[PDB]
């Protein structure tokens, strides 16, 4: 925990603490891409990576990274999500806009599960940090370097889990097992954005548009 401190990951999370429903969510998604960069920089050793690898990781992870951030933000709300733009989006607003299936998945598979285990802001940070250091990302100059950094994050996480939650032995593994849900939701989320772009009746901002362009 001296090479990858959980305290610094938590500082990175705290540093960035924030009419068609689909349009509102997209505006927030753009706003959040800018501050995602600021968050990534404050994650230990991310900036020390070559510039080209910093780009690859963020282009591969922005979906899952952002989804995880707003899910955890929305534990306090009852049946919807808290957008960073300040607006509360209820599941009915979502369903009556045609995106009810993916929205419900976020509520069930992520928000619910985060609430029920009371996932803290440090655990969120670590999980997001794990997602960021994705060694599988195609194009990475040094994959083993990224692989090494992933290991330091989850080692520091297990140390945090066994320490601050000694009564719950399975918490660390429980945390890691929201990642296939995150990944599955991430891809279906991307599939939608491409469609919104394709049909072009939803204004998409520059940074969101840039993330949605072929490698």
């Amino acid at each position: 925990n001296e090479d990858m401190p959980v305290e610094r990951i938590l500082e990175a999370e705290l540093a960035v603490e924030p009419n068609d429903p689909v349009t509102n969510i997209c505006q927030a998604a753009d706003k959040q891409l800018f501050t995602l960069v600021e968050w990534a920089k404050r994650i230990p050793h991310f900036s020390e990576l070559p510039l080209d690898d910093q780009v690859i990781l963020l282009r591969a992870g922005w979906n899952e990274l952002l989804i995880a951030s707003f899910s955890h933000r929305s534990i306090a709300v009852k049946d919807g999500i808290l957008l960073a733009t300040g607006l509360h989006v209820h599941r009915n607003s979502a369903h009556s806009a045609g995106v009810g299936a993916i929205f419900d998945r976020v509520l069930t598979e992520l928000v619910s599960k985060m609430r029920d285990m009371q996932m803290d802001k440090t655990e969120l940070g670590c999980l997001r940090a794990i997602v960021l250091f994705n060694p599988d990302s195609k194009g990475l100059s040094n994959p083993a370097e990224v692989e090494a950094l992933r290991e330091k994050v989850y080692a520091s996480l297990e140390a945090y889990c066994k320490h601050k939650y000694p009564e719950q032995p399975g918490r660390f593994a429980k945390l890691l097992l929201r990642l296939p849900a995150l990944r599955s939701i991430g891809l279906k989320c991307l599939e939608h954005l491409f469609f919104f772009k394709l049909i072009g009746d939803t204004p998409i901002d520059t940074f969101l548009m840039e993330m949605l362009e072929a490698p």
Binding site: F34, V37, K41, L51, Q54, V55, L58, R59, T206, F207, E210, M211, E213
Partner: peptide, 10 residues
């Protein structure tokens, strides 16, 4: 990816 590079540099 213009914006990303610009945002990661500073």
């Amino acid at each position: 990816h213009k914006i990303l590079h610009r945002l990661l540099q500073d």
